[PDB]
Design a protein around this ligand. Structure first.
Ligand SMILES: O=c1ccn([C@@H]2O[C@H](COP(=O)(O)OP(=O)(O)O[C@H]3O[C@H](CO)[C@@H](O)[C@H](O)[C@H]3O)[C@@H](O)[C@H]2O)c(=O)[nH]1
Ligand SMILES: O=c1ccn([C@@H]2O[C@H](COP(=O)(O)OP(=O)(O)O[C@H]3O[C@H](CO)[C@@H](O)[C@H](O)[C@H]3O)[C@@H](O)[C@H]2O)c(=O)[nH]1
Ligand SMILES: [Mg+2]
Ligand SMILES: [Mg+2]
Lengths: 278, 278
């Protein structure tokens, strides 16, 4: 049981961030000085991922141009003695890592986005990271989730308790503990109304999934908001396989919203840059 | 004496904001939900500019794709009934306004960037806006300078007093009053050491300029930081023609650094979005 490939769905419409997202996806929006996606990609590489798979929509070259080499810059910086910046540019992506780009025909849902990656993953377990869920942790959260998958030979979702008023935002897991941080998922519902949400334990955008999910996604139909939900492909996988929920150790920011991106800017400005509101 | 053309230099390397500025200019970095450049362009249109001139570099794609139409997006929105955003998307470039793109061969300086615009400006006075100086004013700051340029038939710089420790950041003007807010300029030096700065009156990135500057720029050689400076071209133009400095009324944030962009996010998030540090 080995995970070396990760999928980054970056093909949503990002309408919550117009006009900022007219020419770039929301996952290219920066927190201080780094795009959301590079945070997630850094986590995945730290977790052992070697093969990055990006599912693009509008402004696809924005992502491609960020992670592909730019020797016009690399040459220019190496000229001006700007050594620190230059290796900072290489630190964006280490040499061994590969990037490959697939196009989503339409933004038909998170689940349809992942199914799009099936030819690239092939038949092996794989990660999924939603970069709008920015997580700051001492140990990479994806490394946390993979360890669980190997031990228990099953899928793993990252999860945290949320307010019951916010369940229209998340897939909500009903589960039974196996250890202090891990539970086995027996039901999962996408964006339940607060009154019917089974629990308050919600899925964050960090997944480790067995290849079996793809067939369950080819059979998946539109659910919440008339979208093909990854959650509903996990719900079909549940009947057949083991799915776990792990309360990872780390701090998540809802950068899919203007308010949580503000808090990410404030918190991480202070932590990694020394920036304090005047 | 009419100013209808404005030049937007967006072709620097933006190294202070790497890695976010690998595939986009710093002027496409957002404050909450609007890129730095769109603030400045909105100001210019309010000030009467009809012709937008963008001087691009390597990362032209982000600037072009932001202000050029995206009927792929316009059509999806027209689908989802989102009337309000659709019009916010068309307003990015209002109906009366046109834009054109000319490219800087290499990031050789701000003055070289402006000289690149000479063919589009032709022979008439024109505005220049540096988008990393984001300004919040009850009356568009460039409109303040245009009125002064018209009145006194001359070039006009926006200026505000700064601490003498920050003189190394800006062009510094030596001048003599003409009225309470306006002075006649007698020298300007780029990034003087504080011990050598003649004054503490600094140039903000808003200019109204006569076409005579262009030949002064063809004759300008590298100065501060091995760059062709617009300031050194203005220092030559001073001797030949009238150059004015106006203490605009408004609140400037130097978003050209991580610190001033953070304080703009904090300040402007609170005022205009209700965003308050947790
Ligand atoms: O057609 C689509 C839809 C989405 N995305 C991407 O998929 C991710 C998720 O999209 P978003 O609209 O942010 O989904 P949410 O409403 O945030 O919901 C998802 O993510 C939550 C965690 O943030 C989970 O709780 C939910 O179960 C899950 O559906 C983002 O990276 C999008 O860019 C695509 O690429 N294509
Ligand atoms: O080769 C280049 C270099 C810069 N730029 C653009 O020019 C502007 C200025 O570049 P920056 O490095 O930000 O210059 P500063 O050191 O901020 O200095 C300028 O801006 C200050 C106010 O912000 C003034 O006080 C200074 O005199 C003036 O030179 C930015 O919008 C860049 O995009 C280009 O288009 N091409
Ligand atoms: Mg989301
Ligand atoms: Mg600047």
């Amino acid at each position: 049981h080995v995970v070396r490939k990760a999928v980054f769905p970056v093909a949503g419409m990002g309408t919550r961030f117009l006009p900022a997202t007219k020419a770039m996806p929301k996952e290219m929006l920066p927190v201080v000085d780094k795009p959301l996606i590079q945070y997630a990609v850094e986590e995945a590489v730290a977790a052992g991922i070697t093969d990055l798979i990006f599912v693009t929509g509008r402004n696809k070259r924005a992502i491609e141009d960020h992670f592909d080499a730019a020797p016009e810059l690399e040459t220019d910086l190496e000229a001006k003695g700007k050594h620190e910046l230059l290796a900072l540019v290489r630190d964006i992506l280490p040499a061994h890592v590969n990037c490959l780009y697939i196009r989503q025909s339409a933004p038909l849902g998170l689940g349809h986005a992942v199914l799009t990656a099936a030819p690239a993953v092939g038949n092996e377990p794989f990660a999924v990271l939603l970069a709008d869920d920015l997580i700051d942790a001492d140990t990479p959260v994806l490394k946390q989730l993979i360890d669980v998958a190997v031990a228990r030979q099953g899928s793993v979702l990252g999860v945290q308790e949320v307010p019951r008023e916010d369940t229209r935002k998340y897939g909500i897991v009903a589960s039974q503990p196996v250890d202090a941080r891990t539970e086995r998922v027996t039901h999962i519902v996408e964006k339940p109304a607060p009154e019917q949400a089974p629990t308050t334990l919600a899925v964050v955008g960090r997944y480790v999934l067995e290849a079996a999910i793809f067939d369950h996604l080819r059979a998946t139909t539109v659910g919440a908001g008339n979208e093909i939900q990854l959650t509903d492909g996990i719900a079909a996988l549940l009947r057949e396989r083991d799915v776990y929920a792990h309360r990872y150790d780390g701090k998540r920011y809802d950068c899919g919203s203007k308010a949580g991106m503000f808090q990410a800017t404030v918190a991480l400005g202070r932590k990694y840059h020394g920036l304090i509101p005047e």
